[PDB]
Design a protein around this ligand. Sequence first.
Ligand SMILES: NC[C@@H]1O[C@H](O[C@H]2[C@@H](O)[C@H](O[C@@H]3[C@@H](O)[C@H](N)C[C@H](N)[C@H]3O[C@H]3O[C@H](CO)[C@@H](O)[C@H](O)[C@H]3N)O[C@@H]2CO)[C@H](N)[C@@H](O)[C@@H]1O
Lengths: 98, 41, 86, 91
Amino acid sequence: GITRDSRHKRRATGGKKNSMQKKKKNTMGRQPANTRVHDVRCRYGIIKRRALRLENGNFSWVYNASDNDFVNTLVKGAIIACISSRPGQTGSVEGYIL
Amino acid sequence: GRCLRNHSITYKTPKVPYERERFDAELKNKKHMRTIAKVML
Amino acid sequence: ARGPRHHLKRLNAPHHWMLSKLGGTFAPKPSHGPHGMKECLPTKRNTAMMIGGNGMGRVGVIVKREVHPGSFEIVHIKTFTTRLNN
Amino acid sequence: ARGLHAARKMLAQRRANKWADKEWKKGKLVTRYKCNPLGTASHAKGLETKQPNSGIRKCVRVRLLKNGKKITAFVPRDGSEVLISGFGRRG
RNA sequence: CGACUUUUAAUCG
RNA sequence: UUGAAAAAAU
RNA sequence: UAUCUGGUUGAUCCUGCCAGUAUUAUAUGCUGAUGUUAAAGAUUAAGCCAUGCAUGUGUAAGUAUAGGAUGAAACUGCGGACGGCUCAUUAUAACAGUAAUAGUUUCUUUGGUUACAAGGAUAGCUUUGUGAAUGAUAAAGAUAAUACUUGAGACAAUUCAUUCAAGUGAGUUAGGAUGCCACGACAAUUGAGUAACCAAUGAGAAUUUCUGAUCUAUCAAUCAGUUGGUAGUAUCGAGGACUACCAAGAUUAUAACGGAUAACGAGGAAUUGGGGUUCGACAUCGGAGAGGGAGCUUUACAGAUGGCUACCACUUCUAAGGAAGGCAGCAGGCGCGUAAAUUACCCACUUUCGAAUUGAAGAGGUAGUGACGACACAUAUUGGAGGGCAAGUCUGGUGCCAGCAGCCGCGGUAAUUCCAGCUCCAAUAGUGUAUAUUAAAGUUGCUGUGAUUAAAACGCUCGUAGUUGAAUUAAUUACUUUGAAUAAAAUAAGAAAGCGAAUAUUCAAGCAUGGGACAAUGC
RNA sequence: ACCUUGUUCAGAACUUAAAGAGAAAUCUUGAGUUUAUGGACUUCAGGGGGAGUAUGGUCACAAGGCUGAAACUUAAAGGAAUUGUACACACCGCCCGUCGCUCCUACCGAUUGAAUAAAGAGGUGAAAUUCUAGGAUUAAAAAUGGAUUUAAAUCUCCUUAUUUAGAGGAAGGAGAAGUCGUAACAAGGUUUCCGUAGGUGAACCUGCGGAAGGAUCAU
Ligand SMILES: NC[C@@H]1O[C@H](O[C@H]2[C@@H](O)[C@H](O[C@@H]3[C@@H](O)[C@H](N)C[C@H](N)[C@H]3O[C@H]3O[C@H](CO)[C@@H](O)[C@H](O)[C@H]3N)O[C@@H]2CO)[C@H](N)[C@@H](O)[C@@H]1O
């Protein structure tokens, strides 16, 4: 479904690119499972730990810089302490005390 | 291309079809290095 | 290509394998291992040895080694010049 | 222009002047695909003289299978689906 | 139909 | 002062 | 071979074109003794397909009461993501060369490291069946694993926060240390097999840097995820690839945006004195596609279609309830058209895949058709006889009629041109005709054209972009010389052929280098 | 100062040439220094017609101007020379335009003229997926519901190419001997031609202004 190639974008001059092929699997995108833990079989057989939702979290010693709407999704750099891991990729929430 | 095997032509017909000074001189049937010499000279 | 290639064409085979152009449509594909496809075989192409460019097959001793931080470095041998990897 | 850096104009100048060529233009603009009864093809299957010569030229009218246009065609010899292939002069 | 002209074209009965 | 035309090819 | 000839006039000298000529590849008319080599449904319809084959695979080393080795089937494993076909797409896209990946990375292979055995069920096996049937499926009862698990002999790599810090042109970099999380073994394997990690294979795959494409102004302004910034998401991974906020930015006369192609690109081919013009679907490299889109599965690799799902459009079987299929694989049929071969045999060459020395392969080889072409080679045709252009001022008819003639023209009754008969002219197993490429064409002009009168100096001046710009002096770029590096085939080169040439290319870019005369950019 | 002489510039010209150039007429203060081919730059041309016509675009109140094809047709058209000559069958020459008769080609096209194949915004929306709920069956897990994502297919207006169209037409071209005139070539019997305006069966005629390609290089 979601592709990540630049065959559908325009040029620096504003030109519209013309199709010469179809969507190829190497440009796969995936639906962003927002972390409000699953596993995804990525390319080359490695596994991605998709944390659908999660509440506990390791930390070491209320605001989203990107989208205020996210304020209770869990993303990197979110303030709750500031999350430092990628929960949607690694599958766990690791953060640090501000 | 069409074939891997090579081929060549072993003759070339003259430019002018009918010239008497050639019909007599040439008379089973009527079927390189000079320039190579030239290029080094 | 959907995946890694397996067959090999006679023409596409490396030159120094000395394969003819009419023996057969295909050439033996070298398996992966300690040596590359174009650096192995399944002057006719300290003292050193040239394995790479035009100097392949030449033995001799180095005089000096210019270095260019941009791209590469050059080795001069008793004289002919070539890159380090050769 | 003749200078060493004026390669843009002479390249541009030649492209413009080529269109004046009657023979060259006929082979590039779109008439060999819509105005030529033969198209680009050699043959085509289908179904009184000038002032100082007197007589009658026997001829034939032919409707082409593909295009459908009607053309006038000569008969080859004395006392002589049809295949038609041009004449000595091209077009 | 013929006559006319190098032929014809017409014309003339 | 008025003064137009000469059937087709050899 | 750096080559021309006929035609405007009573005659001349021009401009200028038509025609003549040679050649390459398509078709086609007539004709055909051999040997060798060899193209062959691309153009028109990536239009439709009847039928048959094109992908299966077994060793001592997985599981076998269908215990001697052997052993079909089945489970399990591997592959069918390579190979083969086609050129519909596509105009800086793809492709070629060059550079990077300190921005990603498997599969295979190769090197290295890190409880005397436990638990259950399952196919083939047997039993019942079902519908017309698909490569159709339902019930029941057993039995194994290198199938699936648990379990121990004791680490490896992920995330996070802090810190010590040597290669490389260049890294808070490889790496070490601290605490945390995650994951967690070297089959409870078989007569070789296995997990995690590191490296190579790997110059490889994939993204990406620079330079390079045909015609068009009767296409002049174009772009709003558009151009950038922050932060996240998603990805194998960089990045507006995407989401939220912020900014107004990006391209263009050095041709942007848009349009056309009877456009897949390159290596190459045809022809050329030099310079160039035209072609390149088609051997090999890269790209894209499987009737049209789209969405997915499995895996290490697919947006796979000789895999699936839905819609559109078709094809087929049907017992009428239902059911499958995708020839642009090999043969072969239709349709189309001027235009293109056998419904052959075999894995014996080359090579690939497989549990592997065996099996399989319409890949591949062999055989068949095959004046596409090419080389050598018997002894008979094709066109022509006014000129161009070699060849009769021979004989019969026809009478501006039939006709011939690529052009000049010949024929109006005594034809060197018609239709015949004879003879000789060119080439010859070939030779006519039509179409198109190239040369001729100095009739497209850089080398190289012309512009008083033959076609052709804007009515005139100003003026932006462009181009071109006097002499003079003891940092880049351009230029120039050498190298490096540079797929083969082909070209040329050391009967057509075939097989190690230093074989040299092969330009446009890019890298290194000696020089600074002629140049451009600011100092 | 005005007139007469010399010297050196700028300007409009003229005379000779055994030279240079050209096809020649002629040019010479270039139309010379060009196959012994390159001083700098801009514009234009590619046999004759169809044609400066059609379509499209744009400027003007309009007449019109600027940009500007193709189909098709044809072996010549043209230049300079052997008092003017477009004549050489040689003026009993050549030739122009309208009309009459056949055939062909493109263009327009009341007939709301259409029709077909391909491109953007809005509506309907299969299917498969991500998530969620459910858990028949034996923690696993099937039917099924719901919300996203990707979106085929279809409908509505709009953007490119290919086709059918009759009254209504309107042009051009080709074919020995068909009509009406005398327009042009001699001073062609009113010198000719260009622009423009008007009239006219037709060539054309007349007004204003140019040009000699004039029948005058001259008082
Ligand atoms: N070419 C188109 C124009 O034709 C116009 O006119 C055309 C006709 O009106 C003119 O006709 C001539 C006529 O003038 C003359 N006085 C008599 C002659 N028989 C006609 O002749 C014409 O028509 C006849 C009809 O049978 C045809 O056979 C003949 O071939 C043709 N030339 O001949 C011309 C060709 O058809 C102008 N004359 C001409 O200038 C213009 O170019």
